[PDB]
Symmetry: C3
Subunit: 112 residues, 3 copies
């Protein structure tokens, strides 16, 4: 298995969430986090001519999927979370060796 | 080392927490997360004949242990977090290459 | 890439945060968590002669960096988060196989 983590803009939550559920992906978990981001400053020159780096609210999405589904999940998240502006966030993929379903004790494990 | 992550029902927190501490496991960290879960609907047919999938509160438990202790910790969590009903949650095991104790600088690392 | 996670005392947040940003490290994310810690008890014998283990607030810092930067980031965190007293926290290093920048779709991946 693989772990997919994504840091996104808070207002994009429902879009990403619904897009995944509609694609048949429902095992995501979301947590509130803080990170650095840009904030436009006042100017007459042009958009973004000046700005500051502030500590602000973001959301962390976590999903554990089979190795074969990784690319598909990434494509969905990228498509739904993108705005085209700086600060859209990043996706990190890491390994998960095994999963255990608490209710039944069922196990799913990677082989050496 | 290995990282053990578990997504459990909020009301099971104290049971799981105390069970682990009493077994000599005290390095757990807990965070609030949201995820999808079922919610029984009204009916006269039978329990669960109808229901909805909602975005609700859950808890994420994280513990880093030696490879040898993994199975033991999993057994404790499963035993304490289980209710037998759908939505009990899952446990994910992943790798941790090294740990550093901030106070002393002491290190513990895996070998290639 | 590698994932660096650190569990620190809440009041050390700004010190660690500023130290990292000033060193050119700005991709950190922070989340609130709870974990066990000591609490000094009343006594006339000596500092720490008695105490209790309580469930209290801590902060989890997460940063994904290139393998080459790991030691540098760890040194900064240790230096800034240390108080010298028990309960300073720990740092865990784990693998990250790939990163995807949501805005552009740009990818960075490890080789087999
Ligand atoms: Ni895996
Ligand atoms: Ni390990
Ligand atoms: Ni890597």
């Amino acid at each position: 298995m693989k772990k997919i983590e994504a840091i996104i803009r808070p207002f994009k939550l429902d879009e990403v969430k619904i897009a995944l559920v509609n694609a048949g992906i429902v095992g995501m978990t979301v947590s509130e986090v803080r990170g650095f981001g840009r904030q436009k400053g006042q100017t007459e020159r042009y958009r973004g001519a000046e700005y500051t780096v502030e500590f602000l609210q973001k959301l962390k999405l976590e999903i554990v999927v089979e190795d074969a589904q990784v690319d598909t999940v990434i494509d969905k998240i990228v498509a739904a979370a993108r705005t085209g502006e700086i600060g859209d966030g990043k996706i990190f993929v890491s390994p998960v060796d095994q999963t255990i379903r608490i209710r039944t004790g069922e196990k799913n494990a990677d082989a050496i």
